[PDB]
Amino acid sequence: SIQLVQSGPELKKPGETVRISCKASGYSFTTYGMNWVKQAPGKGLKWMGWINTYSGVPTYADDFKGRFAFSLETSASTAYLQINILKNEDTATYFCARRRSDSNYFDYWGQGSTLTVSSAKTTPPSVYPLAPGSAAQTNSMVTLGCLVKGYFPEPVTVTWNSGSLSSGVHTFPAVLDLYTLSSSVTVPSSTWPSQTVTCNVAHPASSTKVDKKIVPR
């Protein structure tokens, strides 16, 4: 059946160039023009234009004349978007899409490719165990945390006891010139510190895997 499969996420520096792919399947590739749509994070969809899949001729929307280029290799049913002289504002998710027109609408979409353009260098997190400030006394529960500080780019993953603790786990979204986030887990006070509780932090982009065990303070 019909689908559009796009290449994976990309991280580039300002001034560089990038190419995004859109592989179509399940239909006659040269019959339907390929459209491109930009969506900056939190923002609205910007139609970038479209390319004729038979003649190769691209049609650019007004705000995308200059640094943008649509291309294709029809025998591979694949369309491409190239962006030159990258800048921070190019940070977006990009979609390719097919349109039917006899009724008119975008009937099929790529899953999107996420582009990040930043001057920041890839950086592993410092991980800090967060123990409570006081002993639990007679509270039934206790809440432990991990601080994942100054990493780039997104994302990291945190598990607790190698995935063994799952309920009571809350990983909060990261803030900003690097990323920092925090994970918390809530467990019975009859469980910790009597039993061992360890947070597992993975930041693939730097190939880091860190275990930090929570000890009373």
């Binding site: 459209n35 749509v37 923002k43 609205g44 969809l45 910007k46 139609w47 479209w50 049609t59 929307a61 979609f95 899409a97 009724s103 008119n104 609408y105 975008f106 009937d107 979409w109 790529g110 899953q111 999107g112 410092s126 800090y128 165990p129 967060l130 123990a131 409570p132 400030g133 809440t143 945390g145 601080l147 500080k149 809350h170 909060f172 979204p173 990261a174 803030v175 900003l176 920092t180 986030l181 925090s182 918390s184 303070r217």
Partner: protein, 178 residues
């Protein structure tokens, strides 16, 4: 100047009649528009095509609850008996051909949510380890609250809600409906 104007954000109570507005620029008041809906980490999905007379054709896997209508330059999407699964960003679009060139424009989208819990706070002192490094980060975790709006006051950075939210000072005070 072909332009679509949308109402940006709206919440509704479960069961309520929702009604979103997409307003065409006046020179284009007769245009047919397209509705789409977009889930958080996903491409927009076609919902319906709405004509100036209110006639609409819906995409497939689109409930009977969804309906369209029009009046002048306004195009309306109405979601009766709204459901948690109806949560989406709803976006209208419109195509036109001018001087033998096709042009398409999307509205800015309207984030629709479906809807009381007072937040719980967890605060952490800095670690020994961090202190050796001569830095100190205070951590304020905020959880178990609805609805989403919160303000946090204590070198501060505070996340947005996703409810839950986080604040870091490099006392934590959270205001929520009071």
């Amino acid at each position: 100047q072909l332009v679509l104007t949308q109402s940006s954000s709206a919440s509704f109570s479960l069961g309520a009649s929702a009604k979103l507005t997409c307003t065409l620029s006046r020179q284009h008041s007769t245009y047919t528009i397209e509705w789409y809906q977009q889930q958080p980490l996903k491409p927009p999905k076609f919902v319906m095509e709405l004509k100036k007379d209110g006639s609409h054709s819906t995409g497939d896997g689109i409930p009977d609850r969804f309906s369209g209508s029009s009046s002048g330059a306004h195009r309306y999407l109405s979601i009766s008996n709204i459901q948690p699964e109806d949560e989406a960003i709803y976006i209208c679009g419109v195509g036109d051909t001018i001087k033998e060139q096709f042009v398409y424009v999307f509205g800015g989208g309207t984030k629709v949510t479906v809807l009381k819990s007072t937040p719980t706070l967890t605060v952490f002192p800095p670690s020994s380890e961090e202190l050796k490094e001569n830095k100190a980060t205070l951590v304020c975790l905020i959880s178990n609250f609805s609805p989403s709006g919160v303000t946090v006051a204590w070198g501060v950075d505070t996340s947005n809600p996703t409810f839950m939210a986080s604040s870091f000072l490099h006392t934590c005070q959270v205001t929520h409906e009071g």
